[PDB]
Structure formats: structure tokens, C-alpha cells
Amino acid sequence: PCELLQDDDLSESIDQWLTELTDKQREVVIRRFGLRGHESSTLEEVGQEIGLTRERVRQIQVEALKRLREILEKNGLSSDALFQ
Amino acid sequence: LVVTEIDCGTEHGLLMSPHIEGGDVVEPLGERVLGRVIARDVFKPGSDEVIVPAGTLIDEKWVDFLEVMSVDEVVVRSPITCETRHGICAMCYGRDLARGHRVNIGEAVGVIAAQSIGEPGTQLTAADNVQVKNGGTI
Amino acid sequence: ERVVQEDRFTTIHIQELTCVARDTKLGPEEITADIPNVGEAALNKLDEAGIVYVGAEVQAGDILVGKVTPKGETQLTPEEKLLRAIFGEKASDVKDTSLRVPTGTKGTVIDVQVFTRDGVERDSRALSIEKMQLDQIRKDLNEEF
Amino acid sequence: ASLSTESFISAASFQETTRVLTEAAVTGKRDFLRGLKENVVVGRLIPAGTGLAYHSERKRQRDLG
Amino acid sequence: MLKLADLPESGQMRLFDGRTGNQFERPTTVGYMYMLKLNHLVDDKMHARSTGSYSLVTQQPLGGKAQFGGQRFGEMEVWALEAYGAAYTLQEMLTVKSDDVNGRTKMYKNIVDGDHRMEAGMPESFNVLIKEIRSLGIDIELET
Amino acid sequence: FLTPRHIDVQVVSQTRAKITLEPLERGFGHTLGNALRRILLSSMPGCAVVEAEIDGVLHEYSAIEGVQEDVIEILLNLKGLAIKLHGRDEVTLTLAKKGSGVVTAADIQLDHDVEIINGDHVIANLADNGALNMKLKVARGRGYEPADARQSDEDESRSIGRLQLDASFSPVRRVSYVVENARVEQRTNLDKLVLDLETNGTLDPEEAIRRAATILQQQLAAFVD
Amino acid sequence: NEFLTPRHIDVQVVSQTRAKITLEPLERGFGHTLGNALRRILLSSMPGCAVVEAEIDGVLHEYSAIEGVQEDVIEILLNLKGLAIKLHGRDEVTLTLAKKGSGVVTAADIQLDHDVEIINGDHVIANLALNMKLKVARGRGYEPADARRLQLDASFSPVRRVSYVVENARVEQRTNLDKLVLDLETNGTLDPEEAIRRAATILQQQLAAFVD
Amino acid sequence: EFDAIRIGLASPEMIRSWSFGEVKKPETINYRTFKPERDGLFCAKIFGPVKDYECLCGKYKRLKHRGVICEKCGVEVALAKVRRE
Amino acid sequence: VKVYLAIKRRIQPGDKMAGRHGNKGVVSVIMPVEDMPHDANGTPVDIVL
Amino acid sequence: SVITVGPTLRLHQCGLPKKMALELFKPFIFGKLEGRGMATTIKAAKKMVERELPEVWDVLAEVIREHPVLLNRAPTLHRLGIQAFEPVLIEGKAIQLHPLVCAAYNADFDGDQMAVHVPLTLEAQLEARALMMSTNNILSPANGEPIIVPSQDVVMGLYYMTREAINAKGEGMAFADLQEVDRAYRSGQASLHARVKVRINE
Amino acid sequence: NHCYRVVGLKDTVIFADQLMYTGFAYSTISGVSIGVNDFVIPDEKARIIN
Amino acid sequence: ARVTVEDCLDNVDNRFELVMLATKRARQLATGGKEPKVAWENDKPTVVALREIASGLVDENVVQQEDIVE
Ligand SMILES: [Mg+2]
Ligand SMILES: [Zn+2]
Numbered sequence A: 001p002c003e004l005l006q007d008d009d010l011s012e013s014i015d016q017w018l019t020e021l022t023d024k025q026r027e028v029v030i031r032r033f034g035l036r037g038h039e040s041s042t043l044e045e046v047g048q049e050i051g052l053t054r055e056r057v058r059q060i061q062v063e064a065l066k067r068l069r070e071i072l073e074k075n076g077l078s079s080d081a082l083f084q
Numbered sequence B: 001l002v003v004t005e006i007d008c009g010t011e012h013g014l015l016m017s018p019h020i021e022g023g024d025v026v027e028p029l030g031e032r033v034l035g036r037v038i039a040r041d042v043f044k045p046g047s048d049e050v051i052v053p054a055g056t057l058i059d060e061k062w063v064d065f066l067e068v069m070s071v072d073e074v075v076v077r078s079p080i081t082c083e084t085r086h087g088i089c090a091m092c093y094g095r096d097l098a099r100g101h102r103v104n105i106g107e108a109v110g111v112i113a114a115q116s117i118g119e120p121g122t123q124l125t126a127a128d129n130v131q132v133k134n135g136g137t138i
Numbered sequence C: 001e002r003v004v005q006e007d008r009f010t011t012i013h014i015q016e017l018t019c020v021a022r023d024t025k026l027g028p029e030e031i032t033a034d035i036p037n038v039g040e041a042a043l044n045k046l047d048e049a050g051i052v053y054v055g056a057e058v059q060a061g062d063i064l065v066g067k068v069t070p071k072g073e074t075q076l077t078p079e080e081k082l083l084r085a086i087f088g089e090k091a092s093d094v095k096d097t098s099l100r101v102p103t104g105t106k107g108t109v110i111d112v113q114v115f116t117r118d119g120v121e122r123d124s125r126a127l128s129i130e131k132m133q134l135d136q137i138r139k140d141l142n143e144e145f
Numbered sequence D: 001a002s003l004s005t006e007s008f009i010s011a012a013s014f015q016e017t018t019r020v021l022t023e024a025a026v027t028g029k030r031d032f033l034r035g036l037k038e039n040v041v042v043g044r045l046i047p048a049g050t051g052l053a054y055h056s057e058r059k060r061q062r063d064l065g
Numbered sequence E: 001m002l003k004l005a006d007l008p009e010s011g012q013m014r015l016f017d018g019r020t021g022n023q024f025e026r027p028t029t030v031g032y033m034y035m036l037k038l039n040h041l042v043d044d045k046m047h048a049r050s051t052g053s054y055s056l057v058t059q060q061p062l063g064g065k066a067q068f069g070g071q072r073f074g075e076m077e078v079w080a081l082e083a084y085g086a087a088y089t090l091q092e093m094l095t096v097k098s099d100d101v102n103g104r105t106k107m108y109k110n111i112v113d114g115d116h117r118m119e120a121g122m123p124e125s126f127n128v129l130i131k132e133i134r135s136l137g138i139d140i141e142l143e144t
Numbered sequence F: 001f002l003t004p005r006h007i008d009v010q011v012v013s014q015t016r017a018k019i020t021l022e023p024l025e026r027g028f029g030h031t032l033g034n035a036l037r038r039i040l041l042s043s044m045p046g047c048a049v050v051e052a053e054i055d056g057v058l059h060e061y062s063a064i065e066g067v068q069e070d071v072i073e074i075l076l077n078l079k080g081l082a083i084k085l086h087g088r089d090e091v092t093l094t095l096a097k098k099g100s101g102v103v104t105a106a107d108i109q110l111d112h113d114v115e116i117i118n119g120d121h122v123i124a125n126l127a128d129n130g131a132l133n134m135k136l137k138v139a140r141g142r143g144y145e146p147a148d149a150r151q152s153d154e155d156e157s158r159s160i161g162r163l164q165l166d167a168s169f170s171p172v173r174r175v176s177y178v179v180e181n182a183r184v185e186q187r188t189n190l191d192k193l194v195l196d197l198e199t200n201g202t203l204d205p206e207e208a209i210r211r212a213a214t215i216l217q218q219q220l221a222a223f224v225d
Numbered sequence G: 001n002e003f004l005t006p007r008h009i010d011v012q013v014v015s016q017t018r019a020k021i022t023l024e025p026l027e028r029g030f031g032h033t034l035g036n037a038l039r040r041i042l043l044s045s046m047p048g049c050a051v052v053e054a055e056i057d058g059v060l061h062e063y064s065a066i067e068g069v070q071e072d073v074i075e076i077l078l079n080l081k082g083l084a085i086k087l088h089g090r091d092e093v094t095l096t097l098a099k100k101g102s103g104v105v106t107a108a109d110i111q112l113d114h115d116v117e118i119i120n121g122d123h124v125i126a127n128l129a130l131n132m133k134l135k136v137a138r139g140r141g142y143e144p145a146d147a148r149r150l151q152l153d154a155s156f157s158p159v160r161r162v163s164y165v166v167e168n169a170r171v172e173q174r175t176n177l178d179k180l181v182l183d184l185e186t187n188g189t190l191d192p193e194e195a196i197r198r199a200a201t202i203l204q205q206q207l208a209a210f211v212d
Numbered sequence H: 001e002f003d004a005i006r007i008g009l010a011s012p013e014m015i016r017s018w019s020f021g022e023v024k025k026p027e028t029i030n031y032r033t034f035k036p037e038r039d040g041l042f043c044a045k046i047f048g049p050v051k052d053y054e055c056l057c058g059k060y061k062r063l064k065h066r067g068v069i070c071e072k073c074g075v076e077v078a079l080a081k082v083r084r085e
Numbered sequence I: 001v002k003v004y005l006a007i008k009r010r011i012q013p014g015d016k017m018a019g020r021h022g023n024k025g026v027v028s029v030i031m032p033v034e035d036m037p038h039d040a041n042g043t044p045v046d047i048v049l
Numbered sequence J: 001s002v003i004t005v006g007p008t009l010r011l012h013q014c015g016l017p018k019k020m021a022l023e024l025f026k027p028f029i030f031g032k033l034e035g036r037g038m039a040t041t042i043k044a045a046k047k048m049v050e051r052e053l054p055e056v057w058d059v060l061a062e063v064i065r066e067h068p069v070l071l072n073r074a075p076t077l078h079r080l081g082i083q084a085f086e087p088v089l090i091e092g093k094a095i096q097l098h099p100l101v102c103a104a105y106n107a108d109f110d111g112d113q114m115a116v117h118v119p120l121t122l123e124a125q126l127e128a129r130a131l132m133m134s135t136n137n138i139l140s141p142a143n144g145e146p147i148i149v150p151s152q153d154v155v156m157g158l159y160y161m162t163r164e165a166i167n168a169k170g171e172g173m174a175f176a177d178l179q180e181v182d183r184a185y186r187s188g189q190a191s192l193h194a195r196v197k198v199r200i201n202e
Numbered sequence K: 001n002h003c004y005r006v007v008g009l010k011d012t013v014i015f016a017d018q019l020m021y022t023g024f025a026y027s028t029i030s031g032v033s034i035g036v037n038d039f040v041i042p043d044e045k046a047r048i049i050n
Numbered sequence L: 001a002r003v004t005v006e007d008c009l010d011n012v013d014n015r016f017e018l019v020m021l022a023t024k025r026a027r028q029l030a031t032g033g034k035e036p037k038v039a040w041e042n043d044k045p046t047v048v049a050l051r052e053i054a055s056g057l058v059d060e061n062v063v064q065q066e067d068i069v070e
């Protein structure tokens, strides 16, 4: 029962952290990774309908990745100790 | 055999008498009628007098009260002569429990009575002329 | 307090722990040095072959023998894939099934005995065991002569 | 006196299983969960003790109003 | 031998108290006695667990996780709980704490939330008995 | 009404020493005697070998070549040493001897602030085919402390090199007090204390009473404030 | 040389004569050393004042009673031991009491001088349906009648019942520490809280001469 | 809830209502791959899927559709607890 | 590859101690030296049966 | 775990090791850390109870104050074999049991093991405190004789206290009340059993 | 059994704990011990055997 | 100011309705629906429900009335 609760509590927090992180950057991470029920797509398939470029969708990905990296550090997730 | 009724309403019980075997008594009346309800109205050994007008339960105070009078034969309501269906009345059952009050409505008295017998089981394994010891009448 | 300070009833227990190398159709198991999803503190007491040094003080939950098991068709979830790109963790397709000491058992390794089969390659840790056994069987026979 | 149990789940504990289930099959007796040994195998509340108030409300609201 | 070693004849000498400091008003038998140490230490018998792995057919806790081992709740402890007025205690140790699938997962969330809802659930020891009876050509159903 | 002044220290031996403080009032003699006995055994300044590092062995279980006694028996002999630290709190000592000669407590290199009481205490037996060399490290503590409680001064790299010991230093071993009678020609209820102190030699019996007086006064001061 | 110094968090005062103190932070072997050292000073040898001599008219024996009094002669000596008398002027004085009226004889009718002060004036002595000569002095320890006609026991100690229970205390730093719980019971001549500060001062004065 | 547990005979017309498929082949798992086969003692069409929300051939594996039947393999996607019922 | 650990299990409250005459016993606590009863010489006892 | 007698415990409470209370009350710690605000998610709270920090012991004792745990021996022949107690955080690896309650369990201290049980539902905590408590089952269910009786060690100290002697120290004196008997005895001037006369207010 | 019947249960549990506290404290003051001199063999035992 | 679990059992003389009455009362305090009459002494929700039974401040009628109100 402990392992089944960690996967459920983390899934309810990942989708919640994306809706409170930003507005324009939230739809880019959801399009690259289908965490809200969407289907996974490549960089050329996602960029053909949004951004109209192959490098504009990757520049926002690294910026939003560094922002979520600082959230998990100050929240108390301690990723440096889990992955070691 | 869980208790489901508070009282049946009948008067059917066996007589209780102390152990008068041998020369002296073994168990007096104060221990065999300790915590049991009285079936019928006990009468004084005199001409015509009543002690218990309703026949309620006997507490520790009524035990010493019977030692004042010379009463020796009393009747009590036992669970072997009850009147309920699929159970045992609370009034017909005694009051010997972990508490000091009467039994409750819903207490499983059938399990606590079987464990009390099987628990001490591990601890278990000429006359030509007779005479008297205490002087008295015949 | 005089019976504990004087070290009277303090006995010594010797508990052994053996590790095996199973052979499966998905891939052979070998004793390696690199372990997925670990750090420098976990590999500090370990050598370059995957065997704990002789005399290293180990705690409850340390890695003694490095044993990895290859696997295929992991079918990872999209929630776990999102975390593999943030912290920069590579997707290791080999599961970590190394030997670890149980909880509440801590001590000091006195010796390590290895066993190899015919036609199998050996590591640098087994070379130091046969060298100490060959030097001992040669220094003592030269001294008794 | 222990072989006169109307239930089959409480009679299959000490007696033979194939002897109680065979008689209960050819008879078709719909047995209820009244008692103490029946609710232990099933997993419901026990009427003895604090569970008497639960079975009283269940029987009251059953084709009675 | 007590006379040669400058010791009392009866072997009982009065000792002084360590905490209060007074003298005991009775002779105490002292001396040296050989004692042993058995291999029944508490490091091999003390263990506890809350969650762990379960079997395949019967959802019962067992070892294998190198954490601890669950104890058996035999029938002797069942008759003891029925002797009291315990109804929800015995029902908890038979349905929620063991032999369940949805009841154990839903109960663990109630402990973290702070309110004990005590969901009913269904014991897994009886669901297996239904599938084994229906496969023997004998019918069983719930009339409700 | 009476206070102990100018106590007497009757030193009959290096280890056993008796002291007679002063003829006190009746009632306070037996009270102060049992009170001072529990202080000399609870907390007293002492020094002992905390850890020992040998550059020829990995762990304490395996024996070495040339020494008759086992390594475990060597570490059990270091606990019986009596090292006195005057100024320094923590000092590092060395020991090295080669040849067919037994090693004792006097084989340690002398220091200006390190004074060892016993010199006849043996450590291990040597031979001609082997030799020993190790480094000792002592410290100043208050009471008994095991090796698993004082987990400090570690970097996850000195596991195979450094070996820790069980710090069980206790300068006081046996304390005995009796109630005698004395005459002062002032009152009739007079009694003195005769403390039979048994010190291993790490501390002087005169300073033992002074160090046991400031600790009791610090505990009784909480009632005033 | 660091130690845990106790601090009184609260003083449980249940009555004017009965108190209860607690010392949470203590050492390992100090929870019972300070309790026994303070108990022997308050109980055995505590400076106070009580009755040392009691003489009445017709002191034949201990069992020989006196006529005119409804109470026995044994209960008269038992009521004088509980009387709280406190004087500071002279070291040893002699009191008197002459009661001619019947009904009741109380302790407030005793003629006191400028130095003799009585704490409890409502304490009854004997019931009359008599003239005695008592004497009080200053004593240090509880001395019975066997030590050193007229003779009776004396109780110069202000406190009556002194006890202490040593129980463990949960500390965030140390896992094994015990606390001290002291309780006193006096006859009202001294504050139960101030009596502890007086006993600790006597024990401190006997050691400050050999400390620095 | 439930009550009044009864026992009767298993009618031939009622057994067909409990079952969901007919078992005709005795083989269970293929030799090379570790996957069940149709009309077997461990088949996925009759009893249910092996994994959670995944068919046999792997065509439908999303977590959106709770109940659906794949066109390639006639198996209804569900959880792992349906295989016991 | 097998290893060998060396654990020194010191005595603690909970172990079983007995003699040669058949008197089993579980140790309760470890009392200090000042609390053990001592004779007139000053030798505190270790085991209190 | 192995049982151990403790003379410093009350009749309604017992002892419990610190290492066992962390494994039994593990789901109760995760609920207190999230409500307080120290732990955000449930995954971060798992690494706090396994790291043995200094703040996990203060939050642990909050759920042990009022939580009757169950105790039982291996052979259960009566209803008094399963009694509920209040656990107290003690240091060690043994269960500190009450000396008087050992008469009901019929267990001696020679290496016996007693299992523990932790009720989760608050409905089970109320029926364990009002029914399964050690203070409620003070009378044996067999007869009217109480099951909580002073054992051999307690009755030995009470028999020597109440004894008659012909000659003793301090015999023949009188006392004012019970407060004078305790002061004269602990002062070393009166014997433990001496023929005296006292007046009490009963 | 008489204290619980005439007083109650709240004052009986506290009385049972204080009776155990005063039973262990006074048992340690009286150092009762069994020895070889406690087994008093009667001098007339040899007369009956002979 | 202490727990009284024995005086409340003598009022009902059942020891079974008291558990059912304290269960419905403890859930109203753990969920934050109602406020207890007795002040808080750093106690949990299960033991505080038994303190109101011995004092007579709550009965089978107050618990039923606390559910309809909001
Ligand atoms: Mg046993
Ligand atoms: Zn009936």
C-alpha cells in the first residue's frame, strides 16, 4: 500500500505544479510529454502546428526545465539524494 | 448463545442449597447465590414474612443480610431453565463479570463461559458406624 | 555498569553473505563497477571491479558486491520519463540487483572469497586473492625449510 | 449437539466439507448470516458486543419500514 | 574455607544501600556464581512491519522483502476478542488489515488524510472460496 | 554552624589514599558521605586511548606476524593504561619496537606534557621475525562512552586504516566512607568522615574533593535562583 | 566540564502547607543524589521550635488519667506535639495556661510573652466538663523521649512528610535522563517553597569553604 | 451489501451465463515468446488481459478508454483484477 | 562471490542469562555503579538475583 | 520481542522500543508531517523517517500519547490474554511490561515473546480503551476474586512491614498521627515493627 | 475485592499502583536472603529415622 | 482534569452504547464540523469524547442535533 500511494500522490502533484508554474510554458511541456492525457509527439510534429519552427519549441523547454528544477529543490524533494 | 433479551417474564428456577456433606459445610450459601437474581419471593423461617418482595438481584450487601436470618433454601433463575428463543435473557444470567454491575444487552456469555472451563484444564491430573461432629437436633 | 564497561559478555559473530551470477536469455550477469542511479558515496568504499575492500566498515544498507542484471522492454511511464530529462539521468536499460546487507546488521568484512568457472573471465579482484594465496604458500614453505 | 448447526459455513469448519456441501446442495436451504461464527468467515460485523446496534438497524430496515 | 579467607561463618553479610545510603537490617547472601550467556539475543527476535509484499492467490503478507515478517492471528486470539464487546476490532484485523485489494489501498489514504473512514471492503479469503465452489458444479449466490 | 577547613590527606599508597575532612555536625556526616561517594563515580575527568591506528593491519580481527598475543588482546591492554594530560586536551602518541623484546607502557616516546603513571604494564610479546608500529591517540572525557555513540571525525575513507576503541576511562574505582568520633571541646554531637578513596593514579586525591565540591554547588544553586 | 543545570518550570502548590516541585533537566545519577541529600536535611536535622517539657497537676503515670476531663490523659500529650510554637527572643522560656471555664479549652487562651508567637490558635487541646506547666526550647534534630516526673516526644522539624519519586524525562538530546519530584508538608510556620531554599543553603555552606 | 448466502444446483443454462468463452486448446503459453494463446487455459480473450490497460498484440494501451475491444485481438482492456472474476 | 562480516554483539537489556543450575533470566536494566549494593569494604555487586 | 519487567510503569501503560514504534506507526507519521507543514509530499516524508533526523522524534510522540495498543502472548486460554495498554517510548529492544499484570498473562520472564497490535480505526481505539484496557479487567471472569493481586515479590515486602515483635527499638512510645510515624522511622530512631499506639482520622 | 466493591474503580487502580510501589521499596530495605543456615534441620529427625 | 472512563460507564451501565455515542461524537471533532464543550488539554479526538460523557454535557440527543445544523 505504500508503493501504490507514492505513484498516485506524485501524479497529482506533477499535474498540479504544471498548472501553477506558468501559462505559456505549461502548454509546451504538456505537448512534448502527454502528462494530462495527451499523446506523445516528436519535435517536428509538435512544431508544425505550434511555433512554426523546430528550435523555438526547444528553447522554451530548457527554460521551463530549469524553473522546475529549482521548485523541487526548495520544496523538499531532494533529488540529489534520491538519484545520488 | 449471545444475550439478546433483557428479561423473559417467567419464574422457573432450581433450588440452591449449600454443601452439607460430611461433618462441616464446604461452600456456604453466600457464595452460591452471589450475584444471582431471585426467582420467587423468599419467605422468613417464621410463620409468614417476606424478605424480597420482588425477587431482584443479590449484591454484596444482601449476602450478609441472609446471614442474620436462618434462611437456607432459596430459588434463583438460572440460564438452564430460561424461556427465550435463540439466546439467553439478561435477567436470567448472573452478574459475575469483570465489572460489578449486571450484564449488558449484547455480551457474548457463551464464549466467556467455555473459556473459563477449559483454561484450568492444564492444572488437572469401612464406614460401619457413623458419628456426628456438631451437636444439634435430628 | 561494571559488566558492560569491562567488555565481558561481548561476543563476536561471523555472518556470511553469498552472491550468485545467474545466466538468462536476456543477457548474462557479470560483476561490474558502475551501478545505475548511485552516487560517489556509494562507490567510495567499492573498488574498480565491484567488490568491497577487506576491512571496510559497512553500515545497514551499503553496496557490498556490484551485481547488475540486463533487461529489455521496460515500457517506462510518461511520468517517469519527464523526470529523467530534468535531472539529466540517463535511461539505464539494466536493472540494479546488487547484494546489500539487511537492516540492523553492521560490521567489518574480514575476507572475501571468490569462485570462478572453467572458461569464464576473471576480474582484477580475483588476481589479488590468488597472489596472496601463492605468496603465503611460498613464504611459509621457504621458512619451514 | 454441535452437528445441529443450521448454517453450512459454520458446520464446514470441524465437520467434513464434502458432507455438508452435498446436503446443502440437494436441499437448497437459503442460510442467513445470523450468529457469531458465520460472520468471521464471511467478514461482516459480529452482533455480539458493540455490533448489536448494527444488525438491529439492518433487520429493522428490511421489508418492515 | 570461610574461616581461612577471613570471611563470615554463615556466609551472609549485611550490605549498604547504594541509592539511599542506609544499611539493610538483614544479612544478605553474597558470593561468586558462574553465569552463562545464551544465544537468544534480542537482535534476532525483535522485528516489526506495517506494509510489505503479498502472495499471488491469497493476499496475505509474507517475507522476501528483507524487512520483517508478519505474525499469525490464529483462532485462539479470535475467541478472545469475541469474549469482549469488540466488533470493529476483530472485523478490522480480518478484512482491512489482511486479505484485501481495494480496502488496504483506500485505508492507507485515510491515515495520511487524518480521518479514519473505515471502508467495508471484502475479504479475499472468501472471494477465492466462491470461485472454487462454482467450479465444482455446485451453485452459490447472494440473495441480499 | 560548622564548616570543614584545612582537610587532611593521608596518603598510604600510590593507589589507595584516605582523607579525613573535618569533624562535622551530627546528621550531616552520613549525609555528605553518601553524597560525595556518588559524585566521585559518576563524572570525573579522565583520559584514555580513544583510537589506535596500525599501519600493518586492516581490521582488529586479523592477527599480525611476529607478535605472540592477538591484536584483539593488544587493544584490550591499552584500556588499562593511565595517561595524565596536564595542558593539552588531545595528543597523538607513537610506538615502535623491533626485536625479541616485550613492549611495555614505558616504550612510548616521552613528551613534555604527557606523563604515564604505570611502567610495568605489558602490552604484547614480540619475536625476532616480526615487529610492530602504531600511533596512539588519547582524549579528555567525562564518563563512559561506547564506540558507536561518539561518531565524529570521519570522512568515509579511514575505515580500513583507522581502528576505534571503547572509551571506558574511570579514574576512581572504590569509595568507602565511615563515621568516626572526634573531640573539639565545643559540643557533644561531633563526627568526621573518613573517605577511603581508590584512585588509579590519573588524578591527585586532594584535587578529587575540590572537583567534587564545585559540581555539587552548581547543582544546588538552581534552588536559590 | 559541562552539565545540565535544572530550572524550575513550575511549582505545583496544592495547599498552603503542602507543595510539590519538579526538576526536569538533570543528569543520569543526579536524579536520586539531590533528592536523598535534601530529604535527610529537612527531615532529620532542621532548625525549629517545639515543646520539650510538659507538666500538669497530678502527673502520676502515663496511664493514670485525671478527673474532671472527658478526654484521656494520653490524648492530651498527643495534642501538644502538633502545636506550632515559634519564638525568637529567648533560647528557652516557660509558658503557662490557667483555664477555669468549662466547655472547651483552645490553644489561643495560652498566655504568650513578647517573644512567644503561636501560629495555629484554633487547634483544640482538651475538652473540659485544670492547670499545667509546659516548657519550650529550640531544638535541631527530631529527638524522642528516650534520649536524655515529665517526659514527652519533641518534633522541632517544621516539615512533616518528605518524599521524592525519581522518574525518567524525555529529552530531545539525551534518551535516558531522569527528573526529581519533591513534595513537602509543614505545619504552617514556614513556607513550603522557602523551606527548600533554606535546606539547600545549609548544604551549600558546608562545602563552600573547600571550593574555588 | 449482501446477505442470505444460498446454495443450489449449477444448471447447464446458468453455467453458460457465468463463462465468457469456450476453452478448446490445451496449450497455454508459446515456447519462444512468453505470451498466452487464444482458446487456451490462460487465454486473454476468455479470462482477461495480463497487464494493466493493455491488450495482447499491443494495439490499444492508452489509459483513456476504460472498456473497449481491440479489432486485432478480441480482448477487452481492463485492470489486472478482472482475471480473478 | 561470498563475503564474511564480523559483528560484535555486546550485552544489552533483553538478552537471556542463566547459570549451571537451571535459572533462566532476562536482564532488565543496566544500573550504574553508585546504585549497586556495597559492603563495608566498598565492593559493589554485579548480578542481583 | 522479548518481554521485560518494569517497576516504574503505571497499570494502564506499558513500554515500547523506539525502533518498533517507528515501524508500527509509520502511516501515522506521514499524516502528521503533511498537516504540520514540514513535509510537502508523501515521497519526501519517507526519506525523513529513514534518515533518523532530530525533528522526527518530536512528531512521533504526538501520536503515542493517546493510542491504546494491544498485547497478547502465544497461548491464549482466556479473555485476559489480550489486553490493551498505552505505549511509552522507551530506549532498548524489549517490551517493558507491568509486574502486576503478569498474573493474568501467566507468563514468566525467561525468554517469552509477546506480539503487539496497533488499531487503526478510531472506532477500534474507543472499544480498546473502554473494554480492553488493563484498568477495566481488574476482576477475573471465572469468579469474584480479582486477577490483579500482588505477586510473590510484592507480598514479601508487605508481610515484613506488617509483623509483630516482642522487643524492638522505639517500643512503647506514642505518635500524633501517621505523619509522625513516617518521620520517626526514616530518622533511624524507630524500628519497622514496634508495639506503639497512634490516633488516626479514619 | 472489598476496596473495589465499596469505593469504586478510579480509586482502586490508584490504590493498586501505590500498593505495588510500597511493596518494592520496602522489599529492598529488608535484604531477605536464603542460605545454608535457614534450612533448619530438626535435631529429632535422626531419632525417627533410626 | 484527568481522564474519567469508569464514571461514565456507570451512567449507561451498558459499555456498548457509550462506544457508539463516542464514535459519532469523535468524527465531528476530527473533521472539524463541531466544537467541543470541554476545553482542549493537548489531547486527541478519541479521549476528549469520553470526557463529555462523564460530565453529562452531551447525550444521544445533542449528537443527533449537531448533524442537521451547519
Ligand atoms: Mg516462559
Ligand atoms: Zn430466561
Ligand SMILES: [Zn+2]
Residues within 6 Å of the ligand: H055, H056, H057, H058, H059, H060, H070, H071, H072, H073, H074, H075
Ligand atoms: Zn489486440
